[PDB]
C-alpha cells in the first residue's frame, strides 16, 4: 500500500523537531507517515499536501510554542497550518493534537477562525521530553480512532 496511515502537520518555524521525532517514532512502529518537508527556500505553496491529508487515515497536529499565531484573525485562510487543519476537519479525519510541554491554546478564541476553532476542544497528548515512548504509546491509543 502506497497511502500514508498518518499525516503530520506542524508550524514550519518551531514545530520541525517534535514533528520529526513523532514521525520517526511512528515510522519505527511501522506506521506509514507523511511529513511535507516544506521547510526550504521554495516553501511558498503546494495544494497537493491537502490531497496527502485526504489520502491519510489520521492527522497529527504538532502544537508548539508560537505555532498558532498565524491562525489569529486568518478569516482569509491564508495560513498553511490553517489550511491543513481545515482540510482535516472538512474530511472528518481522526485528528490528534499533540502538545509540546510548554504549549497552550490562545486566550483569543474568537480570533481562532470559526472553521477550525473546535481544535481547542479536542482531546490530545501532552508530550514530555523525558517520557517519549510513554507519550508515543498514548498517541498510539489516539491512532485507534477518536472522531470527536
Amino acid at each position: 500500500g502506497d497511502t500514508p496511515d498518518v499525516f503530520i502537520s506542524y508550524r514550519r518555524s518551531t514545530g520541525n523537531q517534535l514533528a520529526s521525532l513523532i514521525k520517526v517514532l511512528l515510522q519505527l512502529r511501522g506506521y506509514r507517515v507523511f511529513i511535507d518537508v516544506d521547510k526550504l527556500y521554495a516553501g511558498k505553496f503546494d495544494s497537493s499536501l491537502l490531497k496527502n491529508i485526504q489520502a491519510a487515515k489520521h492527522f497529527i497536529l504538532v502544537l508548539t510554542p508560537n505555532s498558532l499565531d498565524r491562525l489569529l484573525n486568518d478569516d482569509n485562510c491564508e495560513d498553511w497550518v490553517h489550511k491543513e487543519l481545515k482540510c482535516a476537519f472538512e474530511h472528518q479525519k481522526n485528528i490528534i493534537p499533540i502538545f509540546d510541554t510548554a504549549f497552550e491554546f490562545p486566550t483569543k478564541e474568537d480570533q481562532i477562525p470559526n472553521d477550525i476553532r473546535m481544535i481547542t476542544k479536542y482531546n490530545g497528548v501532552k508530550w514530555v521530553h523525558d517520557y517519549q515512548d510513554a507519550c508515543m504509546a498514548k498517541v498510539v491509543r489516539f491512532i485507534t480512532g477518536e472522531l470527536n
Binding site: 523537531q17 520529526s20 520517526v24 519505527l28 518537508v37
Partner: peptide
C-alpha cells in the same frame, strides 16, 4: 539498529 531513521530529525533540523 535503524540509524537511517534516527538521522532524520538531525537532517530535518532548522
Amino acid at each position: 539498529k535503524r540509524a537511517a531513521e534516527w538521522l532524520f530529525p538531525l537532517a530535518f533540523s532548522k
